[PDB]
Amino acid sequence: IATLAPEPLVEHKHRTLILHLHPDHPTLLTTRSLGSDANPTRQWIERPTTVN
Amino acid sequence: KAGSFGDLQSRTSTSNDLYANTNLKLQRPQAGIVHTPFTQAPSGFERWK
Amino acid sequence: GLKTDGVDLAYMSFMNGKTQKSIKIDNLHVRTSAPCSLVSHHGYYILAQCPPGDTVTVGFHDGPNRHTCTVAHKVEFRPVGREKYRHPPEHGVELPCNRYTHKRA
Amino acid sequence: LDTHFTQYKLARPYIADCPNCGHSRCDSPIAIEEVRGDAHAGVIRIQTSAMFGLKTDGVDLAYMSFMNGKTQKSIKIDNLHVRTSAPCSLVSHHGYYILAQCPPGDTVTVGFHDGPNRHTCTVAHKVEFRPVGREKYRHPPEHGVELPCNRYTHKRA
Structure with missing residues (x-):
């Protein structure tokens, strides 16, 4: 029986995800821009943060 | 906005009506057990303090 | 575990003197930064649900004396997942953690 | 102690899934x-789902009625333990509900001792104690100024 972080707040912009975000605990977020240019990102988020 | 200040917005204390954008989203209870997953932003009154 | 001879996992045989003392488990205490929760014992070995703790600190109560034992060991509990909790919740998704059994067989 | 038979007579020690x-x-x-x-x-x-307080019938807040079986067990409170990161201090119980002075703790962890068994219950809850003031203590001192905090009562009336 395991973890789960509160859902994100998806916000639209022009080819851009603003994401007001607000976890319970430090959450490792990460992505993969699916181009052959990967351009991934990693950051533990414990403090609520609007990201892009 | 939920999480932001004023997620709960009651006119006064007596006012039974209000505005609660808390993004309250129930999820199914796990593995055949009685409980109530309520997934929710802690308040914009919790922050703001 | 069982006694010297044959009965009841939930009894308690340590050495007093050269001799055993195969009696009841009445007041075991594993603990760390906080008091742990026993999970199960078998043989020399106990499983117990603990929080994180710089140390580990174990002990029963024979009845006349506390008679505990304590040790250093770096402990943590990351749950498996990209969330770095400090403790398992009541809900959330299930996913493949590493963990010890309740059982003896 | 005989002014809240609203709950006492009419409510039972509920049992739920810890x-x-x-x-x-x-x-x-x-x-x-x-x-x-x-x-x-x-x-x-x-709130416990258990209704400690008076017995099933009429006496002594400081007794202890939980559900064993379908049935109550209205007996003494002897060895209650609320606790968190550290063991808390009880403040008062009334009805289903207990007040207890706790330190901060990632969780909350409650339990009495019936006598044959530990029989506790534990839960997650983010706890902190900021005192009111521009000082961010971790704990209330013995001295200092008094100023308008928020706090729960000792009482039942």
Whole structure:
């Protein structure tokens, strides 16, 4: 029986995800821009943060 | 906005009506057990303090 | 575990003197930064649900004396997942953690 | 102690599903809901599903009625333990509900001792205790100024 972080707040912009975000605990977020240019990102988020 | 200040917005204390954008989203209870997953932003009154 | 001879996992045989003392488990205490929760014992070995703790600190109560034992060991509990909790919740998704059994067989 | 037979006569010690009841999810009568680490004074108000207080019938707040079986067990409170990161201090019980002075803790962990068994119940809840003031202590001192905190009562009336 395991973890789960509160859902994100998806916000639209022009080819851009603003994401007001607000976890319970430090959450490792990460992505993969699916181009052959990967351009991934990693950051533990414990403090609520609007990201892009 | 939920999480932001004023997620709960009651006119006064007596006012039974209000505005609660808390993004309250129930999820199914796990593995055949009685409980109530309520997934929710802690308040914009919790922050703001 | 069982006694010297044959009965009841939930009894308690340590050495007093050269001799055993195969009696009841009445007041075991594993603990760390906080008091742990026993999970199960078998043989020399106990499983117990603990929080994180710089140390580990174990002990029963024979009845006349506390008679505990304590040790250093770096402990943590990351749950498996990209969330770095400090403790398992009541809900959330299930996913493949590493963990010890309740059982003896 | 005889002014809230609203609850006492008419409510029973409820039993629900504790989430990490020592081993795992049991059904404890002291199943913890509505943890409120929202005050300042080192205090939390808790609801057990168990209704301690008077007995089944009429006497002595300081006795202890939980559900064993379909049935109550209205007996003495002898060895209650609320606790968190450290062992808390009880403040008062009334009805389903207990007030206890706790330190901060990632969780909340409750339990009495019937006598044959530990029979506890535990739960997650983010707890802190900021005192009111521009000082961010971790704990209330013996001295200092008094100023308007938020806090729960000792009483039942």
